Amino acid sequence: STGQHPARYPGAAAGEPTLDSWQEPPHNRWAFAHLGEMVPSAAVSRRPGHALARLGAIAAQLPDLEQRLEQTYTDAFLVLRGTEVVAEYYRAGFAPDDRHLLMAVSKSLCGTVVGALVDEGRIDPAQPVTEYVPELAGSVYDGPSVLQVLDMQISIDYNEDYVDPASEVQTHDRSAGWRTRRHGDPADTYEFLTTLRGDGSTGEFQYCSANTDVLAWIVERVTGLRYVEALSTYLWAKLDADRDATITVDTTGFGFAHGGVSCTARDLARVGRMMLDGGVAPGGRVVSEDWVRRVLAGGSHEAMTDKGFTNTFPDGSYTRQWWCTGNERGNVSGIGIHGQNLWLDPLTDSVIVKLSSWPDPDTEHWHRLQNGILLDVSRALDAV
């Protein structure tokens, strides 16, 4: 068993409603107001064709920028310098206020929610995961600290290969509803997480999407809130965002914390703005000054043995669900597959959002092109 989880609505039994019960009372009062949480749904537009390019301020220094964005399958691109939007691009068919899947940029949002609860003293990163989720006893998460989950420094038998049909990634997807279930698959994300094992070693970076969903589970046990609601209460509702974000949910209503958030480019930039403002957003403080400082400082370099990342960023590292380049600019970024970045450039007090749809999830080729763009744009923002 996976223990207590936040009810889908006040008074709801465990796991209720399901696809087969949502039309029945008492579930239907909630379900009729939230049907998209149960059944795939399309927007019927209240508004009655070509790319929008407003690169302007940086166009002079990067003349071929629009072409470079096209070549990296860019859907939305936005540069926020200070509080000002100084450059924007949206592909044909994607409106400025359309939402876009963040993939693992979602992880950086989850880490922020954890940080908020650390600031409140409700989570101690030094404590073992099992202090908050006892039901993870007997799994690979039995022993490691919350900080080791945050920093992805737990050795886990989990093949994070996004194209291999046999990988734990796909089983993770099937358990959560991103792919069609197979017979024998775990019923939900919580159950899947408890099946994970490892050799017990810690301290070396291993990127594993399961870690973030464990963080979200901790958030739920500490707050009593559905992760969906915690993500709003501790982060999204303080941003003065233009639109709600969305997050996919599994059959229990658990948000897909490691990859399932969608939002507008402009609103995602507000998360970066909060980070460069020492953790404060328009609606109040989100995380502590110290938390932000530790993110910008980076993780242990020696833990970072991912040759892929360090080939580009030799002094790079990872901490608290952020990638840290360790480059001369101190760039830090949320990253999601197929070309999602929430990229911070503290030197120029700027945030770069790039949301894309590369044909491939993760190759050296696409990252070389993408990082070239983000670095060039960052440098174009320097005083001259």
Ligand X SMILES: NCCCCCC(=O)NCCCCCC(=O)O
Give the C-alpha separation, 58 to 376, whole Å.
10
354 is a site residue for ligand X (CB under 6 A)? no
- Least distance to a copy of itself from the beta carbon of 309, Å? 22
Q: Binds 172, which of a copy of itself, ligand X, none (CB < 5 to 8 A, cut-off by type)?
A: ligand X
User: Which of 104, 116, 377, 381 is in the footprint of ligand X by CB under 6 A?
Assistant: 104
- CB-wise, 55 or 304, nearer to ligand X? 304
- CB-wise, 169 or 344, nearer to ligand X? 169
Nearest one of 89, 48, 281, 258 to 169, comparing CA atoms: 258
- Least distance to a copy of itself from the beta carbon of 24, Å? 8
- CB-wise, 257 or 295, nearer to a copy of itself? 257
Residues 168-187 that bind ligand X (CB under 6 A): 169, 172-173
Q: Binds 308, which of a copy of itself, ligand X, none (CB < 5 to 8 A, cut-off by type)?
A: ligand X
Do 366 and 69 meet the contact criterion of CB atoms below 8 Å apart?
no
Residues 35-94 that bind ligand X (CB under 6 A): none
Please state, in angstroms and as integers, the Cα–Cα distance from residue 185 to each residue in 68, 101, 177, 181, 217, following that order. 42, 25, 11, 7, 20
**Which residues contact residue 273 at a Cβ distance below 8 angstroms, ignoring those fewer than 6 apart?**
80, 83, 281, 351
Give the C-alpha separation, 110 to 252, whole Å.
19
**Residues 193-232 as x/- pattern, contact with ligand X by CB under 6 A:** ----------------x-----------------------
**Which residues contact residue 384 at a Cβ distance below 8 angstroms, ignoring those fewer than 6 apart?**
none
- Bridge partners (DSSP) of residue 355 are 76
Q: Binds 94, which of ligand X, a copy of itself, none (CB < 5 to 8 A, cut-off by type)?
A: a copy of itself
- CB-wise, 99 or 367, nearer to ligand X? 367
304 is a site residue for ligand X (CB under 6 A)? no
- Least distance to a copy of itself from the beta carbon of 353, Å? 14
- Least distance to a copy of itself from the beta carbon of 215, Å? 16
- Least distance to ligand X from the beta carbon of 16, Å? 19
User: Which of 2, 213, 367, 375 is in the footprint of ligand X by CB under 6 A?
Assistant: 367
326 is a site residue for ligand X (CB under 6 A)? no
Token pair recorded at residue 64: 């071929």
Do 74 and 339 meet the contact criterion of CB atoms below 8 Å apart?
yes
User: Which residue number places its CB atom closest to ligand X?
Assistant: 104
Query: Euclidean distance between the first and final Cα of the chain, in Å?
Result: 61
Please state, in angstroms and as integers, the Cα–Cα distance from residue 253 to each residue in 148, 174, 230, 234, following that order. 26, 15, 13, 18
Nearest one of 210, 234, 207 to 220, comparing CA atoms: 234
Q: What does the binding site for a copy of itself look like in residue numbers (CB under 8 A)?
A: 18-20, 23, 25-26, 28-29, 31-48, 73, 75, 94, 98-101, 162, 177-180, 228, 231-233, 236-249, 253, 255, 260-263, 267, 283, 338, 355, 357, 359-361
Nearest one of 292, 293, 291, 319 to 304, comparing CA atoms: 319
Q: Binds 209, which of ligand X, a copy of itself, none (CB < 5 to 8 A, cut-off by type)?
A: ligand X
Do 182 and 166 meet the contact criterion of CB atoms below 8 Å apart?
no
Nearest one of 19, 47, 252, 214 to 128, comparing CA atoms: 214
- Least distance to a copy of itself from the beta carbon of 126, Å? 29
Q: Binds 375, which of ligand X, a copy of itself, none (CB < 5 to 8 A, cut-off by type)?
A: none
Residues 328-347 that bind ligand X (CB under 6 A): 335-337
DSSP 319-374: ETTEEE---TT--EEEEETTTEEEEEEGGGTEEEEEEE--SSSS-HHHHHHHHHHH
Do 126 and 145 meet the contact criterion of CB atoms below 8 Å apart?
yes
- CB-wise, 248 or 350, nearer to a copy of itself? 248
Peptide bond connecting 134 to the previous residue in cis, omega within 30 degrees of 0: no
- Rule CB under 6 A: which residues touch ligand X? 103-104, 169, 172-173, 209, 258-259, 308-309, 335-337, 362, 367
